[PDB]
Amino acid sequence: IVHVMFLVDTAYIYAKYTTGISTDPTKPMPIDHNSEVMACSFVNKPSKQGTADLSFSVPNQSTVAFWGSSLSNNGHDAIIIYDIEKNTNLGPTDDVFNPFVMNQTLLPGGVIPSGSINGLPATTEARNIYALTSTVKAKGTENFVIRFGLYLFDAGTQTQKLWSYCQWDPTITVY
């Protein structure tokens, strides 16, 4: 099971994009490649050889899970991915992944810090978790579209509020 951290620099995006802000998720605001990083484990043999924003090697049919997060681990600003699909606007590309799905599950025993000065020992408690998941169909290079909501912390309400739905067009390679 290959996990991919999808990190977003919300502060940068809020600084740069002052127009074209969208709260219609079918018409998200396009953003450049400077504020997002996708990270996976070394055991999945990542490769900085190539032009792809992410590259790794795992057997066909392995499960892949994408976890979106702001730089505050969704504790201050936050992001939630709502779409991951093949991008056809850049010409033919490979069918590397099966359709992604929003996958919500119960984690019966998730650990959190306890109320001690250093947080130890951890307590375990149930919690819902979510990831966008798929499976590797075949080796190849696939252009993608990734859309997510960008939620900014509002100090007034102490709540995270939608600022804009956004879209990034990475390329991913399974070799």
Add this chain to the structure above:
Amino acid sequence: IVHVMFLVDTAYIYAKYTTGISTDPTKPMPIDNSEVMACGTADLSFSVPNQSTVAFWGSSLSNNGHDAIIIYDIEKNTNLGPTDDVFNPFVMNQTLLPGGVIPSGSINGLPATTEARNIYALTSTVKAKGTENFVIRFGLYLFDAGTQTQKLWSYCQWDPTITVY
């Protein structure tokens, strides 16, 4: 507020470290590649006014949904000689987030719901510009498919260097 993601490749660590596993948090296992910070040889370097707040958020590559990590110590590392006093002491900072967003139960998760949740970060404030050697200790919890729960595998220690300029 400067936020720093502290990411840990729990799968790599579990593959590479086969001895020296410790469940004594006062004698954690040292690690070299598998930890990164995202915001000289400084593992992290950034520039913000003195007295700004800094918040460190620890996470596995599954956002603590499969394996998980929890930082329990961030302190000045004195085993490599004198180093600068760049940060004030860190504290474990737990707060209530009245309105955290989560996906709703729709097919694509939209629109998001809001719900209360406890968050935590290790926080501090910049005392001065400089380069400080640090020690960072954390618990590494692995997902046990048998119980569907995350269980302590080892307490671990990484020794980064951070520069505020």
